[PDB]
Amino acid sequence: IVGGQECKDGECPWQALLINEENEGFCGGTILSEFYILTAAHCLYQAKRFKVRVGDRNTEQEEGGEAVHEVEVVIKHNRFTKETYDFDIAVLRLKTPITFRMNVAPACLPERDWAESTLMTQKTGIVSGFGRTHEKGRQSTRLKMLEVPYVDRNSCKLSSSFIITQNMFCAGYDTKQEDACQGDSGGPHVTRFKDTYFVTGIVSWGEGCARKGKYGIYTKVTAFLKWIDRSMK
Amino acid sequence: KLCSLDNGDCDQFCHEEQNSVVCSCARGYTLADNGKACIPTGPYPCGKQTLERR
Ligand SMILES: O=C(Nc1ccc(Cl)cc1)[C@H]1CN(CC(F)(F)F)C[C@@H]1C(=O)Nc1ccc(-n2ccccc2=O)cc1F
Ligand SMILES: [Ca+2]
Ligand code: NA
Incomplete structure (x- = not known):
């Protein structure tokens, strides 16, 4: 992270x-x-x-x-x-x-339709891991977490050098240097709803880590x- | 009357069913008598941070 x-x-x-x-x-x-x-x-x-x-x-x-x-x-x-x-x-x-x-x-598994209408429509989710603290960096010996904004699919596709399927979603920041990274893959993206955390993503891939004009790509759990x-x- | 306003007052899942709001809960919770709240059935219900020592 x-x-x-x-x-x-x-x-x-x-x-x-x-x-x-x-x-x-x-x-x-x-x-x-x-x-x-x-x-x-x-x-x-x-x-x-x-x-x-x-x-x-x-x-x-x-x-x-x-x-x-x-x-x-x-x-x-x-x-x-x-x-x-x-x-x-x-x-x-x-x-x-x-x-x-x-x-x-x-973490809780949500029901699909409600997840789509209520969780994926939230401002942010939370990603966590033991991965690198910057792109060319070492992995963290301490578990880290990060609040990551949900990113518009159209924006997601335009930003990406690779096809963004409907099984994927973007989260993170355009230029702000915060993202998941190598070592975090497979880990949780969760979204909070009234003090309960629901699984919404699986840390999947990204073109580098926290690059300007690139987003974190996550497996769409819904x-x-x-x-x-x-x-x- | 709608899930789009304060989640139909449901703690967790909300659905407009037979044209009416119905609340439900994740595995490990039981829907409260009031038909809105979700009550954990165990000490480590899913989606809760482990904030207090038992
Ligand atoms: O893990 C990463 N970034 C990351 C991961 C998750 C999130 Cl949420 C945010 C960011 C980067 C860091 N690595 C670089 C390092 F190790 F130096 F940090 C390469 C890795 C990567 O994913 N490459 C990568 C690039 C592209 C594709 N890809 C996508 C679609 C189709 C084909 C395809 O190959 C797959 C990848 F794994
Ligand atoms: Ca340890
Ligand atoms: Na970026």
Whole structure:
């Protein structure tokens, strides 16, 4: 995350971190339930083997609430391709269930029609992660969050060197140097409605990080609510 | 009478159904007797920050 702020205690409890052979974070996830993690399909191609860590806020400090879980099942969207980055969504079923506690709790899945009319119509959403603090920078050892404005689809398409499908949305800023970045992919974009946070996006891709005239591109979770439900069955 | 004004007074989901407003809630909440509020059924309902120590 470029700009934004450190996530305060208890404030980002649905954050998960995919950790490669080496215990190094390369992508985020969102806790959906005791057994299921939401992430981006493209993350699956960036490490041969990985596990999921929950409850972590500082990768260099053992707080005591962290837990590492193995993945039992990977459910990748069958239509994802690297060529398009379209359908950039995957669900992970864990071998052993998460115990919800301090800094470990799921984000809510919204109902589609209401999500479209009430959540996606809000001014801003919230993105979070352990990724780079500027484009060519190092990843953050501390979990960060950022408020990111929703961006008009027409503006999104015009700004982009790549096709923006209906499975994608833009968020962030035109020139202001705040964005998600490398290492944040797969993690949560959530939108608050009366003190409850609903999953609205999956950190997907961007042409660099926080570049002038480019936006953060996110997987449009409203397009995949039924798909998520089936994957969690 | 409409979801477009203060979310039909619903805490969470709102729908105009059989031409009338109906509230509902995410898994882990039960819709209150008043037909508006969402009451968490457990200590770690989805979408809530973990702000207090239990
Ligand atoms: O992660 C990133 N940016 C980022 C990610 C999420 C959000 Cl919300 C905001 C920003 C950047 C940082 N990397 C650069 C680094 F590592 F130096 F930081 C490359 C990466 C990227 O996505 N390249 C990238 C560019 C384009 C496409 N793409 C899109 C559509 C079709 C084909 C296609 O290839 C895919 C990509 F992954
Ligand atoms: Ca830690
Ligand atoms: Na920008």
